[PDB]
């Protein structure tokens, strides 16, 4: 329905969606966060806020 080609078996491997190209395109992970940064002029070289 929609006059579009159905994804066959080979499409599980080819393209940027296949198994081969999976671990290469990067993937989001757990135990992670992000935030804006500021200056810590009192921190040592081996520390961070």
């Amino acid at each position: 329905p929609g006059n579009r080609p159905l994804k066959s078996l080979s499409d599980l491997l080819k393209g940027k969606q296949g198994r081969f190209r999976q671990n290469l395109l990067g993937k989001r992970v757990d135990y992670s966060g992000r935030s804006v940064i500021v200056v810590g002029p009192q921190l040592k070289l081996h520390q961070c806020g």
């Binding site: 491997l13 081969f20 190209r21 290469l24």
Partner: protein
């Protein structure tokens, strides 16, 4: 830099000398004419049209002119010489210096420092294969690229058995074309 690593032919092509000897310069219709007379001597090498936009080079006497003694691989015009020709004419070890200098100069022009061992690690992956011009006796199709180590260890399998003279010449190839053909089937299947 991308044209240097891709091993293309520089649009600002500059013809390189092929044989040592003298040089004969003739003007003409808007480009040039340059015939190198071999120091051997004998057969001369002729370059037909060197557009006037591409001026003459320089060499150490001065701005190289007619009747001058040019060496084997002395560049003739200013611009950019293609690595393939320098490889064919002066050997691999000269093409390595050529590529390294052409890249390191483009980098120095901006005040950036990159130790030569990096560019060397990158270049070493370009001069690994040989092109099989003469299939010889062993199953090697003409015009194919084969790894140097394997191409040499197979002709090492030349226990008399009929002299198998697999003749091939080294090949300089860009990073893309050189990475397309690998030794692990899935690694290549991932392209």
């Amino acid at each position: 830099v991308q044209e240097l690593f891709e091993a293309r032919v520089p649009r600002g092509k500059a013809p390189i000398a092929d044989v040592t000897g003298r040089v004969r310069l003739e003007d003409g219709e808007r480009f040039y004419k340059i015939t190198i007379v071999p120091d051997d001597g004998g057969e001369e090498v002729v370059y037909d049209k060197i557009s006037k936009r591409q001026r003459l080079r320089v060499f150490k006497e001065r701005v190289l002119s007619d009747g001058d003694h040019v060496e084997v691989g002395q560049q003739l015009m200013e611009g950019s010489a293609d690595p393939h020709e320098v490889l064919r004419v002066q050997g691999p070890r000269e093409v390595q210096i050529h590529l390294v200098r052409e890249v390191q100069e483009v980098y120095r022009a901006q005040g950036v420092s990159i130790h030569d061992k990096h560019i060397e690690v990158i270049v070493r992956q370009m001069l690994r294969r040989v092109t099989i011009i003469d299939s010889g006796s062993t199953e090697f199709l003409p015009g194919s690229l084969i790894d140097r180590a394997e191409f040499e260890a197979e002709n090492r399998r030349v226990v008399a058995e009929g002299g198998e003279p697999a003749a091939g010449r080294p090949v300089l190839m860009g990073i893309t074309k050189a990475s397309l053909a690998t030794d692990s089937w899935l690694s290549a299947a991932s392209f």
